[PDB]
Design a protein around this nucleic acid. Structure first.
Ligand SMILES: [Mg+2]
Ligand SMILES: [Mg+2]
Ligand SMILES: [Mg+2]
Ligand SMILES: [Mg+2]
Ligand SMILES: [Mg+2]
Ligand SMILES: [Mg+2]
Ligand SMILES: [Mg+2]
Ligand SMILES: [Mg+2]
Ligand SMILES: [Mg+2]
Ligand SMILES: [Mg+2]
Ligand SMILES: [Mg+2]
Ligand SMILES: [Mg+2]
Ligand SMILES: [Mg+2]
Ligand SMILES: [Mg+2]
Ligand SMILES: [Mg+2]
Ligand SMILES: [Mg+2]
Ligand SMILES: [Mg+2]
Ligand SMILES: [Mg+2]
Ligand SMILES: [Mg+2]
Ligand SMILES: [Mg+2]
Ligand SMILES: [Mg+2]
Ligand SMILES: [Mg+2]
Ligand SMILES: [Mg+2]
Ligand SMILES: [Mg+2]
Ligand SMILES: [Mg+2]
Ligand SMILES: [Mg+2]
Ligand SMILES: [Mg+2]
Ligand SMILES: [Mg+2]
Ligand SMILES: [Mg+2]
Ligand SMILES: [Mg+2]
Ligand SMILES: [Mg+2]
Ligand SMILES: [Mg+2]
Ligand SMILES: [Mg+2]
Ligand SMILES: [Mg+2]
Ligand SMILES: [Mg+2]
Ligand SMILES: [Mg+2]
Ligand SMILES: [Mg+2]
Ligand SMILES: [Mg+2]
Ligand SMILES: [Mg+2]
Ligand SMILES: [Mg+2]
Ligand SMILES: [Mg+2]
Lengths: 185, 144, 60, 67
RNA sequence: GGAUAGUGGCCUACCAUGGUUUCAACGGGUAACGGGGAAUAAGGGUUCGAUUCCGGAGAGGGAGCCUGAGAAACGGCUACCACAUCCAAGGAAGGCAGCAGGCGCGCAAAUUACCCAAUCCUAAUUCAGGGAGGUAGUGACAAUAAAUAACGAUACAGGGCCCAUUCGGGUCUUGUAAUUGGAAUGAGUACAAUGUAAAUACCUUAACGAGGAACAAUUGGAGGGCAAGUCUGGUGCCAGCAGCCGCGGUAAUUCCAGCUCCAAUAGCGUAUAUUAAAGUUGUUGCAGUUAAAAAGCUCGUAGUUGAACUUUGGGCCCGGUUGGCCG
RNA sequence: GGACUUUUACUUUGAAAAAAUUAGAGUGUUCAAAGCAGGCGUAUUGCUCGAAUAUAUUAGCAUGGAAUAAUAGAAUAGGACG
RNA sequence: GCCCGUCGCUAGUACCGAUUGAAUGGCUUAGUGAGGCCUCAGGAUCUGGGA
């Protein structure tokens, strides 16, 4: 006798298991954005699919219909918010367009690389999952964070770790302890 | 218009009629007769556990030539007597008469596999362990 | 048809194929780095284009 | 770190309005400890079988040791 | 009339001959508690709901009843039936479909732990009680996030590119490398404080904690469907494989292995069921000359279905909501 | 308030309407599955936005419509209005 | 070339079938009938017609 903890899944799998072309297609994406899973691509195209759904269902309702205007605006203002949807195409027949890399191009993973600071989509990962770089003073270690546009200017190494001052930390501090212990006394 | 009444009140005819012809569907008839529960060695269930009676040597069907190595099993919950296949090279060496085995289906909705005639099941475990592991070496057969 | 055929030979060919032990090789990176290593293999630096392209050729 | 705080108008008003485990945490309350919650259950249940005082049932059983 | 809290064939007298049914009564089956709902995604559907909420029913099976505002109560009683415990043989006692835990059953399911701190309940009641309930343990049921590595230098090799009368390497990096180089981090371990009813973990964080001997990813597959070899060794219609088609009888692209390779990856195979595919159940939407399928023929009740025709046309006013051209 | 009114189907809007689930707005749980929080200052004595909306059909209720489709009416006039 | 049936071997499934065959479950005739409840009595006792 307690309330159900509700949940849902966040990804969907290809109908055809072995389509040589979709496979090439997928692997490249991974290679470009530093992904480890084909799931991480599944997840997004699944997000995209449902978004497209609601976009369809809306655009069959009359122009200037209440729900269509309310929920339609809402949808766009969310998309623009993260920097997936272009300011020009701000009217949801191009949400109906849209496509995957527009979503991919906005993860913390990418932004941490895109503006310098990593010089490798992989180094980008490794850095994040190791408690370096942050959004505010608030550290983030999730590569798919999705940079909310108006948080892009505040991406920088964290006040902790090296790379943002305040220590070299145990693996270098080990060697420094090996210099004044061998050479000196 | 052929057959089907197109009328606006003909719903009752239209439903009943369907009801009738669902019976020509092999799965619908199977479900409602409860063929699962009635006939059929396994209870309706997915696997079932029995005891090994004799080690057999089923000769395959054409155009294959082989001896196919199986076990007569007597289902525990059932008494029902069944012949099961023991897959992969050897494994008939793993079993022994009077041993317990966990039978499973063959993935054909009932219905025998390939050149093995009569056999509708396969062995999955003996003495609680799994042919597969035994086959490799990851595990060993229990005391007695 | 016939059901009590011989059983003598159960496990024949496995038990007579000569063992060869596995060979010790470099350890392959797991996760991302593997998808990485594939990308560069599959696409970046390429390998051959004999007619079209092949993925596990031996002597060619 | 985000927590919650209180601050009573007096320490007689804290000692009375606070959780009795909180006054313990701090140092303004003794942890008068007791038998296992299940031991106490079993205390009750044994007592349940006895009607009245008890010591009267002692003497009638003191006679038993004769018979 | 009696009975009941009270209506009522609820029960009893008297009287009557009625009530239901092809628009399926009555009977049978259900591996049937009903709903909120769950699974599947063009739509129409198809399958499922013992199970967190609501309703109902039960407490081994039946019946009966005491108390009481409320029970036909079972952690209440009485009896019978079935189980079944203790005995000094006279007797006495029991009801886990509460929480755990044991047997059994089977394909199939966890601790004989802590607490009333929360949530709320009850009492004479701020206080006590609460296996309701919360806490921890067991736990790859499902679901979420996503570690297993990142960066330079060097050794040639390149592909570039300017020049090429011709050595070529030198700049910008493509990377395959059997010596290199310092960097980084939590898996873990653990002062500490935080956490908590007390603990445990999580979040914090001192000291520790990465070079191949790890801190070393798996699960299947590589003939077609179906993404990845015609390598090498073995066997010789044997052993085995193969959902299906098919492979194996001595150069096996299917077996047993080694190497290399594919797909998904902290998860992957398998069995059973169901859904999509399936317009192979067809209302949307099937097919019936010859492939499965028009009753030998006509009549005909139920059922479904069923031609056209009856205030149309014209005139006047009122006030709205979008959109234009101006603002 | 009196006196009387042929029956229906369809469709419209609406009332009555559990929550959780579903769709879905708001909110940066570090992300997310979630959750229903949270956000602002004078962070020494408080300020403040939330906790939407939609679906909820078959039946029943309420109202607008008068096409399509039924029904009943006056022929032994036992007709209709007074 | 294809191809039909009897006949013969191995294995498997279901049918019919002496046993007026067997088992479980639900209702139920007739007979017998616990127990509580209501009721006619009763009166160990214990008081003022009742308990
Ligand atoms: Mg038929
Ligand atoms: Mg064949
Ligand atoms: Mg046999
Ligand atoms: Mg049984
Ligand atoms: Mg107690
Ligand atoms: Mg007491
Ligand atoms: Mg009457
Ligand atoms: Mg009669
Ligand atoms: Mg019928
Ligand atoms: Mg049932
Ligand atoms: Mg239910
Ligand atoms: Mg159901
Ligand atoms: Mg059940
Ligand atoms: Mg009850
Ligand atoms: Mg029981
Ligand atoms: Mg009965
Ligand atoms: Mg009872
Ligand atoms: Mg009980
Ligand atoms: Mg009870
Ligand atoms: Mg005695
Ligand atoms: Mg129990
Ligand atoms: Mg399980
Ligand atoms: Mg209490
Ligand atoms: Mg007191
Ligand atoms: Mg408890
Ligand atoms: Mg590891
Ligand atoms: Mg290492
Ligand atoms: Mg492998
Ligand atoms: Mg292929
Ligand atoms: Mg060979
Ligand atoms: Mg070979
Ligand atoms: Mg091979
Ligand atoms: Mg899968
Ligand atoms: Mg239709
Ligand atoms: Mg067809
Ligand atoms: Mg024909
Ligand atoms: Mg004909
Ligand atoms: Mg007409
Ligand atoms: Mg409505
Ligand atoms: Mg709301
Ligand atoms: Mg007999």
């Amino acid at each position: 006798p307690r309330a159900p903890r509700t949940y849902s899944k966040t990804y969907s799998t290809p109908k055809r298991p072995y389509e040589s072309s979709r496979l090439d297609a997928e692997l490249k994406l991974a290679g470009e954005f530093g992904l480890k899973n084909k799931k991480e691509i599944y997840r997004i195209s699944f997000q995209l699919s449902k978004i497209r759904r609601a976009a369809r269902d809306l655009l069959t309702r009359d122009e200037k219909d209440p729900k269509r205007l309310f929920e339609g605006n809402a949808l766009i203002r969310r998309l623009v918010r993260v920097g997936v949807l272009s300011e020009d195409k701000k009217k949801l027949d191009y949400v109906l367009a849209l496509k995957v890399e527009d979503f991919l191009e906005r993860r913390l993973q990418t932004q941490v690389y895109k503006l310098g600071l990593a010089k490798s989509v992989h180094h980008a990962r490794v850095l994040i999952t190791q408690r370096h770089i942050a959004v505010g003073k608030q550290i983030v270690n999730i590569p798919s964070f999705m940079v909310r546009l108006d948080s892009e200017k505040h991406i920088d190494f964290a006040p902790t770790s090296p790379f943002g001052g305040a220590r070299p930390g145990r693996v270098a501090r080990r060697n420094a302890a090996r210099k004044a212990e061998a050479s000196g006394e | 218009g052929k057959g089907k009444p197109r009328g606006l009140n003909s719903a009752r005819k239209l439903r009943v009629h369907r009801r009738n012809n669902r019976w020509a569907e092999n799965n619908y008839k199977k479900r409602l007769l409860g063929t699962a529960f009635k006939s059929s060695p396994f209870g309706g269930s997915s696997h079932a556990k029995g005891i090994v009676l004799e080690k057999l040597g089923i000769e395959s069907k054409q155009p294959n030539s082989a001896i196919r190595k199986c076990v007569r099993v007597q289902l525990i919950k059932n008494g029902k007597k069944v012949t099961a296949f023991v897959p992969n090279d050897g494994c008939l060496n793993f079993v022994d008469e009077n041993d317990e085995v966990l039978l499973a289906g063959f993935g054909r909705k009932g219905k025998a596999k390939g050149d093995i005639p009569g056999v509708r099941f396969k062995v999955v475990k003996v003495s609680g362990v799994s042919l597969l592991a035994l086959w490799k070496e990851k595990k060993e057969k229990p005391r007695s | 048809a016939k059901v009590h055929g011989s059983l003598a030979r159960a496990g024949k060919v496995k038990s007579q194929t000569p063992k060869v032990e596995k060979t010790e090789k470099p350890k392959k990176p797991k996760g991302r780095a593997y998808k990485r290593l594939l990308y560069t293999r599959r696409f970046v630096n390429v390998t051959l284009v004999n007619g079209k392209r092949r993925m596990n050729p031996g002597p060619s | 770190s985000v927590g919650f705080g209180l601050v009573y108008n007096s320490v007689a008003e804290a000692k009375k309005f606070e959780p009795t485990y909180r006054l313990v945490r701090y140092g303004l309350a003794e942890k008068v400890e007791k038998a296992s919650r299940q031991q106490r259950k079993q205390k009750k249940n044994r007592d349940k079988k006895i009607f009245g005082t008890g010591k009267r049932l002692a003497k009638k059983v003191a006679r038993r040791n004769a018979d």
